[PDB]
Amino acid sequence: ETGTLIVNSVLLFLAFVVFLLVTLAILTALR
Amino acid sequence: ETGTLIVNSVLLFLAFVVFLLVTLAILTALR
Amino acid sequence: ETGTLIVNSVLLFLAFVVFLLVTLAILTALR
Amino acid sequence: ETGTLIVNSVLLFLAFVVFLLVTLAILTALR
Amino acid sequence: ETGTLIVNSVLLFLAFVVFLLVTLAILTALR
C-alpha cells in the first residue's frame, strides 16, 4: 500500500554490514 | 492477512549471516 | 490482538546468535 | 497508542549484544 | 502518518554498531 511495507525490507539491507565485518577480519587473516 | 506479516519473518533470516561470520573466523582458527 | 505483535518479539530472539558467535571465538581463545 | 509502538524500540536494545561481543574479544586482546 | 514509520528507520541505526565491532578488532590488528 505504501513505503511502510518497504521500510522493513530496507532494514534487511543490514545483512551487508555482516560481510563488512568479515571483510576486515579476513583482511588480516587472509587464509 | 498479507505478506506484511511475513515481511518481519523474512528479516529473521538475518540469523544466517551470524553463522556466516563464524564460518570465516573458524576457517582460520579451525579448532 | 494477534501474533502480529509477537512477530517482532520473535525476531528479538536473534540476540542468541550473538552469544553463539562469541562461543566459537572463546572456544579458541579460552581466556 | 499501545506497546505495539514500543515493541520495535525494545528490539533496538539488541545494540547491547554488539558491545558484549567486543567485550569478550577485548578480554583476550586487551590492547 | 506518525513516528511509528520512523521507529523502524531508527532501528536501522544499528548498522553503526557493526563498524564499532570492527573498530576494536582493527585497533588490535591494525593492518
Side-chain angles (χ1 to χ4, degrees), chain A residues 2-4 7-8 10-14 16-18 20-21 24-25 27-28, chain E residues 4-5 8-9 11-15 17-19 21-22 25-26 29-31:
Chain A
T2 180
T4 211
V7 168
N8 289 340
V10 169
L11 177 60
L12 198 137
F13 95 118
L14 93 170
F16 126 84
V17 318
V18 178
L20 191 136
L21 215 312
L24 269 286
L27 239 296
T28 213
Chain E
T4 211
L5 268 134
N8 289 340
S9 180
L11 177 60
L12 198 137
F13 94 118
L14 93 170
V17 318
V18 178
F19 269 84
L21 215 312
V22 97
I26 214 193
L30 256 85
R31 233 92 271 285

Side-chain angles (χ1 to χ4, degrees), chain A residues 8-9 12, chain B residues 3 5-15, chain C residues 7 11:
Chain A
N8 289 340
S9 180
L12 198 137
Chain B
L5 268 134
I6 280 149
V7 168
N8 289 340
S9 180
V10 169
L11 177 60
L12 198 137
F13 94 118
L14 93 170
Chain C
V7 168
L11 177 60

